Write a protein that binds this DNA or RNA. Structure first.
Ligand code: GTP
Ligand code: MG
Lengths: 206, 488, 349, 230
RNA sequence: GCAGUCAAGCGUUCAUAGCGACAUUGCUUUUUGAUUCUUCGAUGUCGGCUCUUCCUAUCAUACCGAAGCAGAAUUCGGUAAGCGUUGGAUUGUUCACCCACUAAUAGGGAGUGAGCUGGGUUUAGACCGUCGUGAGACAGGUUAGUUUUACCCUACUGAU
RNA sequence: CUCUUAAGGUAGCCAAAUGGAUUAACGAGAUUCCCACUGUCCCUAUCUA
RNA sequence: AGAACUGGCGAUGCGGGAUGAACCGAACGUAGAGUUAAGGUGCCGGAAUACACGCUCAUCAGACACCACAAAAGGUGUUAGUUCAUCUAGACAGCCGGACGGUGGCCAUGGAAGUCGGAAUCCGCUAAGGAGUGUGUAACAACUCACCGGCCGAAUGAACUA
């Protein structure tokens, strides 16, 4: 590697105006589904992002009290933080938290069977291996091939029940990893439903 | 250099058309106007034709019967000040200026060399913008003549670093906190050791705050207050050179101390606790404020800019006697103090729980509001001089503007790349300077909520800044050794 | 699961936990390969060690995460009590660290195994293997402070008494040094210490007894001081949350005597400060240590301060001792019979 | 059960009559049982034991040292203390890689009898924008498990690493082929996105393109490390 | 692994010419057990019935040691290979998984390519895809397809 | 140079009875399942030339 | 790894290294006698169960590829050295006695009196005695060591090298 004044030097760089230009355009843009992205422009994104949350992360307790002092033989922790204000407010702060518990048992009764089968002393059956298919590494490998190979993925949908037959997951992957791949639905089996229903679904998916 | 990308073939033909003009059509529609103060009072209905915002002063000034000019706003959705009426009745929101203009600080004067170490602190004199002291990691402090850009008495005494410094509000005495155990009082003019050094604290000194003038008797010097890493606070008398009462409520180190309006010390400390401390009880606690999940860094007051300067307003034209200095110190205080005709000093804190609580300690030991926003720790907090906006510096490279009265979020300043260490205001309450872990300092237009001007200069980290009270001059100091002064 | 958590595996410190799981791979998996085997055989060998060492950890942590009682969504009494012993934030963090460290080991396993299928010699494969197991060892070495914490909470939380909130109980409360352990000693079978100084009991003890062919449960509970009441100790707070959360009766215990270094006005000031705990409850007061000193003997202005305690809507003020044990047997009968009326009046709704 | 039962039991009933005599002797024998374990314990149990005993010495040096040290007797601001943390490239002349290693041959056909496809076994930065090409037209296969996006860059100043995204591969030693496929190797010089560090040129512009040299062989462990050329 | 930090020592003699053990800090993505549905190109053959033996790097049974080991159950470790280690479902593939019994369903070696087979060697037939002007070949994919010993010496098992 | 999202309630208008290759029948063609039945198997035993 | 030179083998038997392309010895006609090389001398096996001074015990020593690898270290295994210390003003090992006063030092707290903790770690009387090495009490108590001292009487300790 031949020594050079190139390297050590700064290659790319950005204007302090141009940051102020690009930070605004996150606010403006606006996507349009009939439009589609070919190239992205190389941009220092970590500078342009961080938008305003209104909440903050939680405080770091480990710094103030370790663990050995929080509980043990070593244990320097006589009184609780933050602790309650007053014994009216404590007894107020119990009685709702009782009834909130007493709710969840009456709820998770009606959600249910699962315990009563264990009390009766029997288990539910084995799930059949065919209901997996598929799933399987051999075919999902075959999937991530053709996404990587293709320049427009298209995604065919059963025009009886397209919401059930969509899948999320891949579309969430595609936007994160590979935005240059274009993506487009095809409702088909448009015979097997009535004519208004197909016309509706293309409206609700367009 | 990555660019702002070019205008398209259509966007040229947009520009090539003649368009617009400012015009003002005539303009005379009779639209009704209400007048409202931001303090409290509503004052009831006029209905004129449309006019320039210079004239709506002259409509008000005869009605109230003053000659006080006034700043205007409208639509509070929106919040934004014919110039309104183009955006489409108007509730007009009037508010006093304190009439001024401090300029945007643009150019450097060339870099003043001196002591061969990092610069740890840097305080202007109150009364004039020529005089400015710096404390370095070299054991010398140094006072700079800032008009001539050159050293006025290179100053020696200590045998460790000098961490904080402060100029007394009357402007007789400088005080210098140290990494050893000591404080040394100095005269600016002579630059000589006023007796033996003040020794009392066992570990290093964290901050130094002066007793402000309007409390102190006319013809007595102001007492110092000094917080230290052992966690005590002592109150130093300058003449006798001896502490009256040690105060030892806090268990951990005290991060900063401030002397308040009404005889009341405040001490922000590493035991997650803010101790309101009455002077008249002769070293005694009155109220103990607990919110924070981490330790407390820094503690800003609403009055702190007025208490720091103490009588010397922007001209720097001196008090003829102490009895005058009493009244001048009281009048600059009572510009900001009587907001609704009542002395409601606001206190605010920063801490590593990523949060600032807002306090009014005389009225209630509860907090008012929880300013929550930042990702990493807030470090410096500052009220604006007029007690109207708060702003706080943080380690997530961004400075957040909060309304002072109700602790309500306003906006965020974005621009800084690396972590922001401290900030300071222009006296007119418009411009706002900030300093970073990177080279650059930046100055922030508070009215439009925007970057006014970036200024690069230094070779390394920049720890300290301060704005001069007149608002010609801004100092800076950091790791590259060189003091840079900045001006218009 | 409900009511006491004895069965949680046990959980080594990171030095030893690493020493287990690494050495189990050396033992259980085959340890010989030779370089002039076929590359498929060399790749299989090393793949299997990274996998097996992965699932060594992802076993060991999963038993911790499954074992430990899941502090919110237990029951608000227990949810509290484990805060007041173990600290609820440190508790929840320490487990959540182990939950994160579970995921990184899986990630490291799955990423390296996918590299290790392209390994073109023994050396490359061998280095990729050591590179995987070093990363796992580094993740687990970063777990030294939580595992030491959890190991000690496991030991303690096994040793708690099971109390049902839902059963008929009775709390037994007051100042230190009053008597209220030696009541619990003599009413039921239990080993609780009876020693003349303040905080002898430091946690909630339990004992059961049958009256009217029905299991009750007494709870002896360490003792309360009056205080400014924002700050009381983790020892004292147990009792306050016991009186707050649990249903049941409660016996207040006064010592009317010169004994206890504790003034008898301050016992009443305790009662009136604690009063808003009792609103749901049903209460009795018990004057322990009669035999020396008596309630009848007392000064009049002093004896007014019992009649102040009478004014609270639903109480009674029993004499008792532990020298004659017919009298202590009457106290439980009144205590139970006041309870069962409230349970039946609750049931018949 | 309930609370500190064994402790209460020891406090009342009391230990075991020859407990003291047992425990005292075990500590006497422990001297002998260390020296037996050292001269038995074959084969790994022997290695571990010695590795441990070295540490249990090296600690006891440092305790006795620190006692002898304690027997005798940069500068930052307030808000930063009470805290903690030629034009030679640093690797000139790296080992040369043959073209026959790196490029594994892939044969195609029912009779596996056509060769011609080549697989890059070394690690690769590929692009932002990639897509594979048709299987008939392809040849120089860079497989997806060996496609690094982010490197692990470190600074000679400061003493902090950051996990930074790769922007390009500019100079690759051992031929201009492997630059153009984007093969990371040891020695290779790569464009790094630097924005988490927060470097600013004098001029006031702020920087997000630094060249960095890779310090390790990321074949032999999956991580691509690198040092900034500052 | 890379980049450092401390320093018991080497470096002919040697503190501060360069090396340097044991410790130790940096991230490889959120500190509140949330999910984290990430399955991302093994270009090379193994897999299973029958049956034997060996190793121990011990899953179970035997005897010990240490743990907040009260019991009960369990974890970790020592000697230990005497003796065991199963039944099924799944090829839109199984370099694996699940559920069921069980004291327990440990890991390996020599395997059982002439004892018998299923995929793959693997040729002639045929179709679909990709490539080729074409003959044809292959990024593929699918279907049909004869190797049949012992009677010799030895070993082994029984027999004079 | 300018420019593309309308169809609405369990089966619709429509076109020379149907809206079709989701094609009947046939097959030593390839493959999955169910009943019946069984020494395929648990687990082998016996008999004839 | 590629260059340069000189040996050895290929065309070459024979003695030794248990066996062997390259290792140690060695000028091949056929015989006899003598003396040796390298290697050997318990028995197999020709030749000392020779002589002399030391070292080593391995619950599967070693008899060696050596001027390497697993290697750098772990051991209350043995012997010989080197450099500092301590000692009839009594060492080392044992028992016996002392180990105290300001004081229960300050904050901390339900309770912490040298010994759950955090900051200091000082003065006095001393032959000597830490604002305490550990066991131990809810806290104190009692015991212990580190340091003095009496009894006993002459060598002993520590760290390295081989
Ligand atoms: N004279 C007398 N003394 C009693 C009686 N009951 C208890 N005591 C005394 O109470 C002292 C011990 O108190 P505990 O019974 O432990 O009551 P407690 O300390 O409040 O209870 P815990 O804190 O839970 O142990 C003993 O010294 C007893 O002598 C009594 O009937 N008569
Ligand atoms: Mg008691």
């Amino acid at each position: 590697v031949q020594p050079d004044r190139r390297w050590f030097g700064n290659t790319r760089v950005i204007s302090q105006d141009a940051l102020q230009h690009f930070r605004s355009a996150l606010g403006e843009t606006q996507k349009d589904t009939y439009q589609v992205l070919l190239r992205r422009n190389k941009l220092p994104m970590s500078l342009l992002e961080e938008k305003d949350a209104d909440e903050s992360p939680k405080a770091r307790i480990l710094d103030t009290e370790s663990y050995a002092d929080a509980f043990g033989p070593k244990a320097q922790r006589k009184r609780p933080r933050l602790a309650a204000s007053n014994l009216e407010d404590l007894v107020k702060a119990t009685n709702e938290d009782i009834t909130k518990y007493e709710e969840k048992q009456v709820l998770d009764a009606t959600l249910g069977g699962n315990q009563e089968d264990k009390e009766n002393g029997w288990t539910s059956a084995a799930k059949e291996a065919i209901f997996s298919k598929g799933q399987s590494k051999r075919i999902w490998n075959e999937l991530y091939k053709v996404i990587d190979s293709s320049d427009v993925v298209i995604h065919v949908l059963d025009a009886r029940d397209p919401l059930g037959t969509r899948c999320k997951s891949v579309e969430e992957y595609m936007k994160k990893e590979t935005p240059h791949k274009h993506l487009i639905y095809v409702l088909n089996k448009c015979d097997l439903v009535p004519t208004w229903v197909a016309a509706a679904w293309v409206k609700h998916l367009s | 250099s990555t660019l702002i990308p070019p205008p398209s073939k259509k966007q040229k033909k947009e520009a090539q058309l003649p368009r617009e003009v400012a015009i003002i059509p005539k303009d005379l529609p009779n639209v009704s106007i209400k007048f409202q103060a931001l303090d409290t009072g509503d004052n009831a209905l006029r209905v004129p034709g449309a006019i320039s915002e210079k004239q709506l002063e002259e409509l008000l000034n005869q009605l109230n019967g003053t000659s006080v000019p006034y700043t205007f706003s409208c639509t509070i959705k929106a919040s934004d000040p014919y110039s309104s009426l183009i955006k489409p009745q108007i509730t007009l929101l009037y508010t006093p200026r304190a009439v001024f203009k401090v300029k945007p600080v643009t150019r450097s004067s060339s870099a003043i060399a001196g002591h061969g170490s990092t610069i740890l602190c840097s305080a202007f004199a109150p009364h004039t913008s020529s005089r400015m002291v710096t404390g370095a990691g070299d054991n010398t402090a140094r006072i700079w003549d800032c008009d001539t850009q050159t050293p006025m008495h290179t100053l020696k005494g200590h045998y460790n670093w000098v961490l904080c410094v402060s100029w007394s509000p009357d402007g007789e005495v400088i005080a210098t906190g140290s990494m050893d155990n000591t404080i040394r009082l100095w005269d600016p003019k002579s630059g000589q050791c006023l007796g033996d050094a003040l020794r009392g604290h066992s570990k290093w000194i964290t901050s130094l705050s002066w007793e402000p003038i309007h409390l102190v008797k006319p013809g007595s010097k102001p007492r110092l207050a000094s917080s230290s890493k052992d966690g005590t606070i002592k109150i130093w008398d300058t003449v006798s050179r001896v502490c009256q009462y040690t105060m030892s409520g806090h268990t951990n180190s005290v991060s900063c101390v401030k002397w308040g309006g009404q005889g009341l010390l405040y001490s922000g400390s590493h035991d997650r606790t803010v101790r309101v401390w009455d002077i008249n009880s002769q070293g005694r606690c009155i109220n103990i404020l607990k919110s924070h999940a981490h330790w407390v860094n820094h503690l800003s007051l609403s009055t702190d800019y007025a208490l720091r300067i103490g009588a010397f307003d922007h001209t720097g034209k001196k008090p003829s006697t102490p009895e005058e200095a009493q009244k001048k110190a009281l009048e600059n205080y009572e510009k900001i103090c009587k907001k609704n005709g009542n002395s409601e000093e606001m206190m605010v804190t920063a801490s590593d729980d990523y949060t600032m609580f807002l306090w009014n300690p005389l009225k209630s030991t509860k907090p008012i509001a929880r300013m929550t926003g930042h990702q990493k720790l807030v470090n410096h907090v500052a009220f604006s001089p007029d007690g109207r906006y708060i702003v706080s510096a943080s380690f997530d490279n961004s400075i957040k503007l909060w309304d002072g009265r109700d602790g309500k979020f306003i906006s965020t300043f974005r621009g800084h790349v690396a972590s922001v260490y401290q900030v300071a205001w222009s006296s007119d309450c418009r411009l706002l300077v900030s300093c970073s872990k990177d080279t650059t300092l930046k100055v922030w237009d508070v009215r439009t909520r925007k970057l006014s001007v970036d200024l690069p200069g230094h070779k390394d980290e920049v720890y300290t800044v301060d704005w001069s009270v007149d608002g010609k001059r801004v100092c800076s100091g950091g790791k590259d050794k060189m003091v840079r002064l900045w001006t218009h | 699961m409900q009511l006491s958590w004895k069965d949680i595996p046990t959980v080594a410190p990171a030095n030893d936990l690493l020493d287990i799981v690494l050495n189990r791979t050396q033992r259980k998996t085959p340890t010989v390969i030779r370089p002039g085997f076929k590359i498929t055989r060399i790749r299989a060998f090393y793949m299997r060690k990274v996998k097996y060492t992965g699932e060594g950890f992802v076993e060991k942590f999963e038993d911790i995460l499954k074992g430990f009682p899941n502090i919110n969504d237990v029951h608000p009494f227990h949810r509290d009590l484990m805060d007041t012993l173990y600290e609820k934030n440190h508790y929840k963090i320490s487990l959540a660290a182990i939950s994160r460290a579970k995921s990184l080991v899986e990630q490291v396993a799955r990423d390296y195994v996918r590299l290790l299928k392209f390994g073109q010699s023994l050396f490359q494969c061998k280095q990729l293997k050591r590179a995987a197991l070093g990363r796992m060892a580094t993740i687990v070495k970063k777990l030294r402070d939580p595992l030491a914490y959890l190991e000690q909470v496991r030991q303690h939380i096994g040793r708690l008494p099971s109390i049902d909130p839902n059963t008929r109980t009775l709390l037994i409360c007051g100042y230190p040094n009053v008597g209220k352990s030696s009541f619990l000693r003599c009413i039921t079978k239990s080993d609780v210490d009876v020693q003349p100084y303040a905080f002898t009991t430091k946690s909630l003890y339990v004992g059961h007894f049958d009256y009217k062919y029905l299991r009750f449960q007494a709870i002896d509970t360490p003792g309360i001081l009056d205080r400014p009441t924002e700050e009381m100790n983790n020892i004292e707070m147990q009792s306050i949350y016991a009186i707050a959360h649990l249903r049941s009766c409660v016996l207040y215990f006064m010592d009317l005597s010169e004994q206890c270094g504790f003034t008898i006005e301050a016992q009443v000031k305790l009662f009136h400060s604690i009063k808003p705990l009792f609103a749901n409850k049903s209460v009795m007061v018990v004057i322990n240590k009669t035999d020396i000193i008596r309630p009848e003997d007392l000064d009049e202005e002093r004896a007014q301060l019992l009649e102040s305690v009478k004014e609270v809507p639903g109480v009674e003020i029993m004499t008792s001792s532990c020298q004659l044990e017919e009298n202590v047997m009457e106290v439980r009968n009144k205590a139970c019979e006041k309870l069962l009326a409230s349970r039946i009046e609750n049931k018949l709704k | 059960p309930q609370n500190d039962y064994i402790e209460r039991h020891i406090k009342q009933h009391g230990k075991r009559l020859d407990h003291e005599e047992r425990k005292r002797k075990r500590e006497a024998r422990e001297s002998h049982k260390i020296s037996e374990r050292a001269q038995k314990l074959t084969g790994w149990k022997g290695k571990q034991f010695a590795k441990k005993r070295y540490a249990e010495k090296v600690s006891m040096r440092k305790k006795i040292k620190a006692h002898e040290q304690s027997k005798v007797k940069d500068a930052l601001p307030t808000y930063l203390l009470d805290r903690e943390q030629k034009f030679s490239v640093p690797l000139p002349k790296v080992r040369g890689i043959s073209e026959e290693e790196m490029f594994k041959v892939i044969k195609t056909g029912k009779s596996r009898s056509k060769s011609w496809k080549r697989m890059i076994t070394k690690h690769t930065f590929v692009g932002e924008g990639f897509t594979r090409r048709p299987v008939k037209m392809e040849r120089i296969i860079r497989p997806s498990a060996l496609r690094q996006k982010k490197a692990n860059v470190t600074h000679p100043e400061l003493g902090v690493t950051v996990f930074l995204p790769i922007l390009a591969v500019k100079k690759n030693p051992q031929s201009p082929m492997y630059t153009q496929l984007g093969v990371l190797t040891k020695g290779t010089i790569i464009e790094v996105n630097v924005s988490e560090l927060g470097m600013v040129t004098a001029g006031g512009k702020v920087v997000w393109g630094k060249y960095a040299q890779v310090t390790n062989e990321p074949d032999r462990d999956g991580c691509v490390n690198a040092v900034l050329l500052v």
